[PDB]
Structure 1
Amino acid sequence: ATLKVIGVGGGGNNAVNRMIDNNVEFIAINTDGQALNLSKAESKIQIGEKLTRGLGAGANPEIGKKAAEESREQIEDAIQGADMVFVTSGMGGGTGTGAAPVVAKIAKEMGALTVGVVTRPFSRQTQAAAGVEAMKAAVDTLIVIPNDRLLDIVDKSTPMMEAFKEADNVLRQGVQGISDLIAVSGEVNLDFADVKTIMSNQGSALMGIGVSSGENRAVEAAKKAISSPLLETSIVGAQGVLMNITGGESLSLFEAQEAADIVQDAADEDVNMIFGTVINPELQDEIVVTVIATGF
């Protein structure tokens, strides 16, 4: 499975520059031609050249949205061949904010599992909130992750793709009535209220993702999956919890039972829990635990 990481706008370009420093391709997209010159990505696309001709360096999301639509054909050609796509506009609230949803819409309408990666903190009248809402509408799964843990999505790409495929199958079948899902990785400083606005009023779920390898991998992966402030409060009171651990041939029943215990003890006593264990060679020595909390 081939992955493509697309940084949109100044923020995404800087994110992409850091992640370059494999089997993952990097694309940089921006309305600002001056900034793409500073991108280290092998694939660069300047979008909306007709639309932005004569303008200066602007911060209008609408220009970015229409810039991406003007260059739709160039974007499809660069994404062609991608199984999964990571789209992020990074720490910026300008054109990239508007272009990034369109890039995801293209990746999605091309049949690639499309993940929106949000590093910019948010919660309502900021441009950040508007962008996050727009991205949410366009992607299969939105994932919120600390800016300093950004390299994890490329470093641990194969386990992450298993987690996003799990979220995809949960949505498709409406497991435990879930119809809307946001993913979390790392020490994301948020509570359900900060994201309640932009999720469906019934069927909303939060998925924590923990990945680890080496010694005490199962314990660490399971604890990271529930260590985010967002999962710590949501897991308490959660009427339902979907728990899955996936590893390679080396995954023992001891590691699987321990991970389940850690999640069960954190969860409510009356919680309706579904436990899953999967032996998947492709993970090699990596472990990934997903914990989906619903029914708040």
Structure 2
Amino acid sequence: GSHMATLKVIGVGGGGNNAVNRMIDHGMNNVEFIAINTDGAALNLSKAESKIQIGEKLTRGLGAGANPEIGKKAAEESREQIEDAIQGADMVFVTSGMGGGTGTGAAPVVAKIAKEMGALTVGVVTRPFSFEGRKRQTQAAAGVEAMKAAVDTLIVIPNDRLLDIVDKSTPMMEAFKEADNVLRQGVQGISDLIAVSGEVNLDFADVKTIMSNQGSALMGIGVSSGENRAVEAAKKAISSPLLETSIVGAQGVLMNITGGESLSLFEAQEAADIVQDAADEDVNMIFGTVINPELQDEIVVTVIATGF
């Protein structure tokens, strides 16, 4: 009868595994985590239930030393181990920091395997800070292009955008958590969509329609209360300052609105218009509604945007 979607989040390389570690700390049920690295010492500290050391013959348990070809060969030589860990997933999020050796080279191989295994495959990757220099940025760009060829949808977070949301004292780790929220809240928004039946119900097949073989994507969530809550939640959903791909130009959108018994038709249209006017395109919308009576004055808008 009913379908149960298996979501897996895969961290590849140092930055991706720290995202996984921090997401596990935050708490994420129903999602399964996989940690993939050449660096055996970092893998030893991973909180992920499923750990895969790749490239031990190539690196002797060290990182890739910024050589993406070593990350790529390490992933290819552990293909069977990667397939075994993914097998059964309906959706896979591959998160990695681009510009080093393991993420840049291995993350596109992991994404390709996930897609070959039948999983809807989303990449969420960072680009390096400009202060890391041009060779790092150029390697990262080759990684991004390789990711884009391997995934169904790709979200790119330029680390330079973190400098737009900090003050001179913000701990680096606090900035990194802001970047993690892009992946965490996207995963959580899909999980929630999949676990609850809506009054206007969207399910994993709608996620597939909007994300499959699409390229660049935006995933966002917004929460507001009071008057203008619908407009404010929709603006929050689509307005992250950390994204390379904004909502502008979107041609397909999956939008789900969750609220209490007070959720009004009028405000549902307001939220939908905010998104479609922001896109500045004729948006093919997949619209859903959930009534959670536990919510009183709160409204949550979830947006997945593709078709750029």
Q: Normalising by the residue count of structure 1, what TM-score does the alignment of the two structures yield?
A: 0.63
Residue-by-residue CA offset, 1:66-97 (whole Å, 9 max, x unaligned): 11111111111111221211101136522221
Residue-by-residue CA offset, 1:255-283 (whole Å, 9 max, x unaligned): 31120233355465999999777889999
Other-structure match for 1:219: 231
**Alpha-carbon distance between aligned partners in 1 of 2:95 and 2:165, rounded to the nearest angstrom:** 11
Report the Cα offset of residue 43 of structure 1: 1.1
Deviates more, 1:145-154 or 1:202-211: 145-154
Report the Cα offset of residue 174 of structure 1: 23
Alignment check: 8 A CA contact 1:241 1:294 kept: yes
Other-structure match for 1:256: 268
Residue-by-residue CA offset, 1:92-111 (whole Å, 9 max, x unaligned): 52222110111111111111
**Alpha-carbon distance between aligned partners in 2 of 1:183 and 1:164, rounded to the nearest angstrom:** 28
| Closer, same or farther: CA 156–295 of 1 in aligned 2, 3 Å | farther
**Alpha-carbon distance between aligned partners in 2 of 1:187 and 1:12, rounded to the nearest angstrom:** 36
Other-structure match for 1:19: 23
SS in 2 for 1:260: helix
**Alpha-carbon distance between aligned partners in 1 of 2:201 and 2:155, rounded to the nearest angstrom:** 13
Report the Cα offset of residue 49 of structure 1: 2.5
Deviates more, 1:268-277 or 1:171-180: 171-180
Matches within 5 A, 1:183-194: none
Q: CA RMSD in A?
A: 10.5
Residue-by-residue CA offset, 1:161-186 (whole Å, 9 max, x unaligned): 99999999999999999999999999
| Closer, same or farther: CA 160–110 of 1 in aligned 2, 3 Å | farther
Deviates more, 1:41-50 or 1:183-192: 183-192
Alignment check: 8 A CA contact 2:68 2:101 kept: yes
Deviates more, 1:60-69 or 1:253-262: 253-262
Q: Gaps (5+ residues) in structure 1?
A: none
**Alpha-carbon distance between aligned partners in 2 of 1:170 and 1:269, rounded to the nearest angstrom:** 24
| Closer, same or farther: CA 244–87 of 1 in aligned 2, 3 Å | same
Residue-by-residue CA offset, 1:148-172 (whole Å, 9 max, x unaligned): 9999999999999999999999999
Deviates more, 1:196-205 or 1:227-236: 196-205
**Alpha-carbon distance between aligned partners in 2 of 1:188 and 1:143, rounded to the nearest angstrom:** 27
Residue-by-residue CA offset, 1:25-54 (whole Å, 9 max, x unaligned): 111101121221121212110012233349
Between the aligned residues of both structures, percent identity stands at 100
**Alpha-carbon distance between aligned partners in 2 of 1:191 and 1:82, rounded to the nearest angstrom:** 16
Deviates more, 1:67-76 or 1:163-172: 163-172
Alignment check: 8 A CA contact 1:93 1:131 kept: no
SS in 2 for 1:99: helix
Q: Normalising by the residue count of structure 2, what TM-score does the alignment of the two structures yield?
A: 0.61
**Alpha-carbon distance between aligned partners in 1 of 2:116 and 2:242, rounded to the nearest angstrom:** 30
SS in 2 for 1:243: strand
Deviates more, 1:222-231 or 1:152-161: 152-161
SS in 2 for 1:45: strand
| 2:81 counterpart of 1:69 | no
| 2:113 counterpart of 1:106 | yes
Deviates more, 1:186-195 or 1:212-221: 186-195
Alignment check: 8 A CA contact 1:191 1:229 kept: no
Deviates more, 1:244-253 or 1:110-119: 244-253
Alignment check: 8 A CA contact 1:226 1:263 kept: yes
Deviates more, 1:48-57 or 1:258-267: 48-57
Other-structure match for 2:60: 53
SS in 1 for 2:194: strand
Aligned match for 1:146, one of 131, 154, 158: 158
| Closer, same or farther: CA 259–182 of 1 in aligned 2, 3 Å | same
Alignment check: 8 A CA contact 1:90 1:120 kept: yes
| Closer, same or farther: CA 41–278 of 1 in aligned 2, 3 Å | closer
Report the Cα offset of residue 218 of structure 1: 2.9
Alignment check: 8 A CA contact 1:8 1:96 kept: yes
**Alpha-carbon distance between aligned partners in 2 of 1:158 and 1:252, rounded to the nearest angstrom:** 39
**Alpha-carbon distance between aligned partners in 2 of 1:271 and 1:219, rounded to the nearest angstrom:** 17
| 2:82 counterpart of 1:78 | no
**Alpha-carbon distance between aligned partners in 2 of 1:159 and 1:111, rounded to the nearest angstrom:** 40
| Closer, same or farther: CA 73–288 of 1 in aligned 2, 3 Å | farther
Deviates more, 1:52-61 or 1:105-114: 52-61
| Closer, same or farther: CA 289–15 of 1 in aligned 2, 3 Å | same
